[PDB]
Enzyme design. Structure first.
Site, PDB file in Angstrom:
ATOM      1  N   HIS A  45      46.155  71.858  52.223  1.00 60.48           N
ATOM      2  CA  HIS A  45      47.576  72.097  52.023  1.00 60.48           C
ATOM      3  C   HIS A  45      48.151  71.247  50.893  1.00 60.48           C
ATOM      4  O   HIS A  45      49.310  71.410  50.522  1.00 60.48           O
ATOM      5  CB  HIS A  45      48.382  71.955  53.331  1.00 60.48           C
ATOM      6  N   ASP A  89      41.673  73.119  56.906  1.00 62.58           N
ATOM      7  CA  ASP A  89      42.603  72.414  56.026  1.00 62.58           C
ATOM      8  C   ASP A  89      41.887  71.267  55.303  1.00 62.58           C
ATOM      9  O   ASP A  89      42.206  70.097  55.500  1.00 62.58           O
ATOM     10  CB  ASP A  89      43.786  71.893  56.859  1.00 62.58           C
ATOM     11  N   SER A 171      48.937  63.288  54.533  1.00 66.24           N
ATOM     12  CA  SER A 171      47.983  64.388  54.435  1.00 66.24           C
ATOM     13  C   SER A 171      46.709  63.975  53.721  1.00 66.24           C
ATOM     14  O   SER A 171      46.775  63.347  52.663  1.00 66.24           O
ATOM     15  CB  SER A 171      48.607  65.505  53.616  1.00 66.24           C
TER      16      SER A 171
HETATM   17  C1  LIG Z   1      51.797  68.466  49.968  1.00 67.68           C
HETATM   18  C2  LIG Z   1      52.249  68.030  51.366  1.00 67.68           C
HETATM   19  C3  LIG Z   1      53.262  69.050  51.885  1.00 67.68           C
HETATM   20  C4  LIG Z   1      54.038  68.466  53.064  1.00 67.68           C
HETATM   21  C5  LIG Z   1      55.262  69.358  53.333  1.00 67.68           C
HETATM   22  C6  LIG Z   1      55.815  69.203  54.726  1.00 67.68           C
HETATM   23  O1  LIG Z   1      55.967  68.110  55.212  1.00 67.68           O
HETATM   24  O2  LIG Z   1      56.153  70.291  55.435  1.00 67.68           O
HETATM   25  N1  LIG Z   1      53.167  68.379  54.249  1.00 67.68           N
HETATM   26  C7  LIG Z   1      52.856  67.234  54.892  1.00 67.68           C
HETATM   27  O3  LIG Z   1      53.237  66.121  54.582  1.00 67.68           O
HETATM   28  N2  LIG Z   1      52.059  67.499  55.950  1.00 67.68           N
HETATM   29  C8  LIG Z   1      51.495  66.517  56.886  1.00 67.68           C
HETATM   30  C9  LIG Z   1      52.302  66.425  58.162  1.00 67.68           C
HETATM   31  C10 LIG Z   1      53.532  67.051  58.272  1.00 67.68           C
HETATM   32  C11 LIG Z   1      54.243  66.947  59.453  1.00 67.68           C
HETATM   33 BR1  LIG Z   1      55.923  67.784  59.641  1.00 67.68          BR
HETATM   34  C12 LIG Z   1      53.758  66.232  60.524  1.00 67.68           C
HETATM   35  C13 LIG Z   1      52.531  65.597  60.405  1.00 67.68           C
HETATM   36  C14 LIG Z   1      51.811  65.708  59.228  1.00 67.68           C
HETATM   37  C15 LIG Z   1      50.540  64.928  59.445  1.00 67.68           C
HETATM   38  C16 LIG Z   1      50.656  64.400  60.853  1.00 67.68           C
HETATM   39  O4  LIG Z   1      49.836  63.719  61.435  1.00 67.68           O
HETATM   40  N3  LIG Z   1      51.836  64.823  61.328  1.00 67.68           N
HETATM   41  C17 LIG Z   1      51.823  68.862  55.986  1.00 67.68           C
HETATM   42  C18 LIG Z   1      51.071  69.652  56.850  1.00 67.68           C
HETATM   43  C19 LIG Z   1      51.022  71.014  56.640  1.00 67.68           C
HETATM   44  C20 LIG Z   1      51.710  71.586  55.582  1.00 67.68           C
HETATM   45  C21 LIG Z   1      52.465  70.804  54.728  1.00 67.68           C
HETATM   46  C22 LIG Z   1      52.523  69.429  54.917  1.00 67.68           C
END
Ligand SMILES: CCC[C@@H](CC(=O)O)n1c(=O)n(Cc2cc(Br)cc3c2CC(=O)N3)c2ccccc21
Ligand SMILES: *[C@@H]1O[C@H](CO)[C@@H](O)[C@H](O)[C@H]1NC(C)=O
Ligand SMILES: [Zn+2]
Ligand SMILES: [Zn+2]
Length: 215
Positions: A45, A89, A171
């Protein structure tokens, strides 16, 4: 990282800070980890039009001699990556050149640890510094509420009675259990209530080996 602590600078020398460029929005950010001198593992992602990797960082706002800012030549997103389920992912990034090995840069109910520069709270900005948190590996039923969670493909991570969790911006960071990488940060709830869902690395070993031999 929510509920973690600041790392001693450079104590996790495999950690990679990723700036992700896309055509229609400002830069986004992820973590990742160096597994070969010219390969970084991260989440699918985090794919974009282009990516830059910074190795050797601690405070990412403060440039220092340990930094190696490296171009990514090619992104290898898992071909089965699914944006609806978030299955598979995982992504490999091939660096344009091999990183230098230095002290600060090198390749990589049980308790595991995960580090990152992500948000330190639901409403908090990304951290300037690398943080790490210890999380409990959970039985898969703990993640049943994630309807597309799959025990074969994923780990369920974080005691729901603690606030500790990886979060936005983390991520792609490796989850280490007994010094061995077992998972990769993937997704969780928007309110950060644990557990969260990590990629199970073991499932992807043949594919990882495949890419590493072909490039
Ligand atoms: C390029 C990173 C994009 C950002 C955008 C977003 O926060 O929606 N992103 C991101 O930071 N994450 C990791 C994430 C997001 C969320 Br809400 C909750 C959690 C995580 C990791 C985790 O452990 N919990 C994402 C997981 C799936 C898709 C996009 C993601
Ligand atoms: C990170 O570096 C910036 C610039 O040097 C500084 O303002 C900030 O206080 C630093 N953060 C930490 C936690 O060291
Ligand atoms: Zn330093
Ligand atoms: Zn698969």
């Amino acid at each position: 990282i929510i509920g973690g602590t600041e790392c001693k600078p450079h104590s996790r020398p495999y950690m990679a800070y990723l700036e992700i460029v896309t055509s229609n929005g400002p830069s986004k950010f992820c973590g990742g980890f160096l597994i070969r001198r010219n390969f970084v593992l991260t989440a699918a992602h985090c794919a974009g039009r282009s990516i830059t990797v910074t190795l050797g960082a601690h405070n990412i706002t403060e440039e220092e001699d340990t930094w190696q800012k490296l171009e990514v030549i090619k992104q290898f997103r898992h071909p089965k990556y699914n944006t609806s389920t978030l299955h598979h992912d995982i992504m490999l990034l091939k660096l344009k050149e091999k990183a230098s090995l230095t002290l600060a840069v090198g390749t990589l109910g049980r308790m595991c640890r995960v580090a990152g520069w992500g948000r330190t709270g639901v409403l908090k900005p990304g951290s300037d510094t690398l943080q790490e948190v210890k999380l409990r590996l959970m039985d898969p039923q703990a993640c049943s509420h994630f309807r597309d969670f799959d025990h074969n493909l994923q780990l369920c991570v974080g005691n729901p009675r603690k606030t500790k969790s990886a979060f936005k911006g983390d991520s792609g960071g490796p989850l280490l259990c007994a010094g061995a990488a077992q998972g990769i940060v993937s997704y969780g709830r928007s309110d950060a209530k644990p557990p969260a869902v990590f990629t199970r690395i073991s499932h992807y070993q043949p594919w990882i080996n495949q890419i590493l031999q072909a490039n």
